[PDB]
Write a protein that binds this ligand. Sequence first.
Ligand SMILES: Nc1ncnc2c1ncn2[C@@H]1O[C@H](COP(=O)(O)OP(=O)(O)OP(=O)(O)O)[C@@H](O)[C@H]1O
Ligand SMILES: Nc1ncnc2c1ncn2[C@@H]1O[C@H](COP(=O)(O)OP(=O)(O)OP(=O)(O)O)[C@@H](O)[C@H]1O
Lengths: 208, 213, 213
Amino acid sequence: MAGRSMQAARCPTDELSLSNCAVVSEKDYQSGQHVIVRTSPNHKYIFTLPSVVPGSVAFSLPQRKWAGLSIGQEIEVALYSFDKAKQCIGTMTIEIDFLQKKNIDSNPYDTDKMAAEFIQQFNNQAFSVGQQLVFSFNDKLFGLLVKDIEAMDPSILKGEPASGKRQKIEVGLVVGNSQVAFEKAENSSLNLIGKAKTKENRQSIINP
Amino acid sequence: DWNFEKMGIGGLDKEFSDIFRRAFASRVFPPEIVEQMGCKHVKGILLYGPPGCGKTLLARQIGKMLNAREPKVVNGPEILNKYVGESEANIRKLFADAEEEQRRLGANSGLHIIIFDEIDAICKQRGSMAGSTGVHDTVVNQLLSKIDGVEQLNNILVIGMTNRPDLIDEALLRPGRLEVKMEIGLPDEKGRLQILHIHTARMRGHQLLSADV
Amino acid sequence: DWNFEKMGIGGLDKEFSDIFRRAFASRVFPPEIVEQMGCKHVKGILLYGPPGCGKTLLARQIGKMLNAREPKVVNGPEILNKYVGESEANIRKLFADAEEEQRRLGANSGLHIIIFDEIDAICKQRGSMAGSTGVHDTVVNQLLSKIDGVEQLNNILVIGMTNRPDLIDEALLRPGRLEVKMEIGLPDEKGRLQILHIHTARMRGHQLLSADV
Ligand SMILES: Nc1ncnc2c1ncn2[C@@H]1O[C@H](COP(=O)(O)OP(=O)(O)OP(=O)(O)O)[C@@H](O)[C@H]1O
Ligand SMILES: Nc1ncnc2c1ncn2[C@@H]1O[C@H](COP(=O)(O)OP(=O)(O)OP(=O)(O)O)[C@@H](O)[C@H]1O
């Protein structure tokens, strides 16, 4: 699909900033389409797509920070071949902390809820490694950073027992059965549990 | 087609006789008389001894001896996994089929045979373990519940082999799970002769061994 | 295009001859007599001695000698990883190709070579680490089970080099796993002479050595 030259605009609203979507005018593209934004020959970013000017793509501040996009830069916009029965995550690993240090407390949060809510809110969205985002629970704010992405084994998509040969993928698609894990950054107080929130057994030496 | 000679076992006559006696006598009698006595059946075996005597060979030959569903073999610590609680999923997936079959047929169902290899890797004393990894304790406890919990399952046989019997937990080595605990030892001259003849059968058959031997 | 003098190894003629006799004899002899004989190949060699005698050279030259796939090499403790169960997966990832080919082509299959450097870093006698031993014992049991388990491999050859042979677990050294044990020691005078010519051949050829030496 041929690249279009577009102008970088500012995301119109913070509500649209919470969707992690690149906001476009309806004349240019449709909701739910995917694009590759090329910023240079070596940098390709894949994004999910009335107040946006036709011929402009409005980016949120987090997306611009992650992708390095300035407002008004001319950009080539095309599309990723988003494979079908492969990418779609099986489980993902994310790093969590309080979004702002002033809200910290040390009591445990029941967090399987927060994963189920994550799957409900960001269903069918594109996600990639290194991406940064924000989440909310108990009316407290959390910053998130994706660190690993295992696909489903395509057999599960075929309706068959998994072999365990989970591929690791540069981009994944959330689907209604994906799962996610929330490992803390060391410095922290945010106690967490849930059960399925996942914490790999720490395998760490200790001296007597 | 089974006969003892086809199994190729060496000089383990007494052990084999004791095993068949203490594990398989009940299943061979007609259902009427065994029901008349009303006794329960063994479900476990624990072989042990010094390295390199043939324990796995005996287990696989036992597997061949029985006509039943293909044994499910857990090759060492393949159960551990990095997500919380996933190993317990694997464990329960093992027993699901047997449970369903026994529910569907009742007292007159077939037998299922399960072989556990390198049992010491999974099951070690719950209390005496690295504090950091309660996953082992959960596994042991879960296993103990499943094999012998309030609910009774009677169409399973569990085999476990190790090299250092001391490490095994006391809670598992109790009647109902593994009471029969065998010790394999070195053979005598006759057993060695049997082994040599076994390993020399083809050479004699194909006439590649000199008569001076 | 293989020549014994090409590998530039001097002073180890007897050991190499013995090694060749014990290791590659079955695979070079014509097959038909071998199928009549009914034997299984040997899948283990270990080399030990004091530092700086030329073990790694032997391993590398042996690897180049054989006509097979590119060998898989593990440089020391590359297997350890922060998440439980991944060490075991990696270990399995070493033997997966062998398993696939064995299943597919059966008897008519190629050879696979795996080299372990500093095996003593990962393999130690079980029940010797006071802390965090949960990973070590799993590693050791996994390796033992993989080398010889219920499933049988017939396309694998293993070569190992080590410096502390007396600290290794006995279970890895029983016959059937690492049979050919070799000691490389200090050379005698004749070996020193041979080595000096070996390493001075180019200089002599190019006339860069004076005539009074
Ligand atoms: N008593 C025996 N009778 C027949 N074959 C034997 C006997 N002892 C050893 N062997 C041969 O050597 C192998 C060694 O035994 P096996 O492989 O069962 O190991 P094990 O002793 O059960 O295990 P480990 O070495 O891990 O303690 C046998 O599989 C067989 O090929
Ligand atoms: N017997 C020998 N014949 C010829 N060259 C030799 C011999 N022994 C050592 N060398 C020379 O010494 C170099 C270093 O030897 P090498 O690294 O193989 O020793 P090593 O025993 O593997 O090491 P270490 O045990 O100390 O880890 C070789 O690459 C070779 O050039």
